[PDB]
Amino acid sequence: AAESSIQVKNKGSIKLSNVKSVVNSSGKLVITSRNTELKLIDEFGRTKESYKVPYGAVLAKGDGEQVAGGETVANWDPHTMPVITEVSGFVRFTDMIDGQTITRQSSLVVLDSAERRPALKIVDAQGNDVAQYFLPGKAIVQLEDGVQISSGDTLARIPQ
Amino acid sequence: DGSDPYEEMIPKWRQLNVFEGERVERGDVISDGPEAPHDILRLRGVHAV
């Protein structure tokens, strides 16, 4: 199934555990921990649903909220795992080569390991130093330098 | 891990799940895929297998 939405059969309050709270561009939170699970409590301690949550997921309703059921409680990309930004502001791109590590689709690829992955931290405002950014194979960043991106935001990574 | 680094080699044909450190504990899934009962007993314990 291509749908990444999670449905809830019965009105049980979500009990999220073993998760990492990271502030995103909105009121929702993004989990950076690979191992996550969901538990539902409605009137007793017995659980009803478990499911699973991958890294970089965005929850629709906050933890401990009595969801009425039948509505999505967490949303994530079924094809890509986003990487959040620990520092909010402009992104510093190091060793950007045009014609070899740039692929027009602005949305441009970062670098290719076979063709050659510089690591740099996100700038505070314009170019201040404040975090290691890893660029695997076929990794593409659609935001340019000076974009002033906020924390918890990620573009398409384009997994190989 | 404080002392005695663990030496492991990945044939690069399989992706790495945890890019950063994140304080990976023993028994964590470094690479996705089915796991053998042999590895479960050695690390996760006799009860887990």
Helix/strand/coil (H/E/C) assignment for every residue in chain A: CCCCCCCCCCCCEEEEECCCCEECCCCCEECCCCCCEEEEECCCCCCCCCCCCCCCCEECCCCCCCCCCCCCCEECCCCCCCCCCCCCECECCCCCCCCCCCCCCCCEECCCCCCCCCCCCECCCCCCCCCCCCCCCCCEECCCCCCCECCCCCCCCCCC
Q: Which two tokens stand for residue A137?
A: 């194979």
Q: What is the CB neighbour count within 10 angstroms for residue A125?
A: 11
Resolution (A): 3.8
**Identity of residue A78:** P
> Which one-letter DSSP state was computed for residue B24?
P
Residue B29 near chain A (CB below 8 Å): yes
Residue B28 near chain A (CB below 8 Å): yes
Q: Do B19 and A134 make contact, defined as CB atoms within 8 angstroms? A: yes
Element (DSSP H or E) covering residue B25: none
- C-alpha A149/C-alpha A128 separation (Å) is 14
Q: Do B20 and A34 make contact, defined as CB atoms within 8 angstroms? A: no
**Could you report how far apart the first and last alpha carbons of chain A are, in Å?**
21
Angle at A154 between CA A135 and CA A123, to 5 degrees: 75
Q: Do B18 and A132 make contact, defined as CB atoms within 8 angstroms? A: no
> Which one-letter DSSP state was computed for residue B37?
H
**Identity of residue B23:** R
- C-alpha B27/C-alpha B23 separation (Å) is 12
Choose among B16, B19, B22: nearest Cβ to A33: B22
- Give burial (CB, 10 Å; 0-12/13-18/19+) of A31: buried
- Which of A137, A134, A136, A140 minimizes the C-alpha distance to A103? A140
Best mutation target, A18, A35, A133, A154, to test chain B (most B CBs within 10 A): A35
Q: Do B29 and A32 make contact, defined as CB atoms within 8 angstroms? A: no
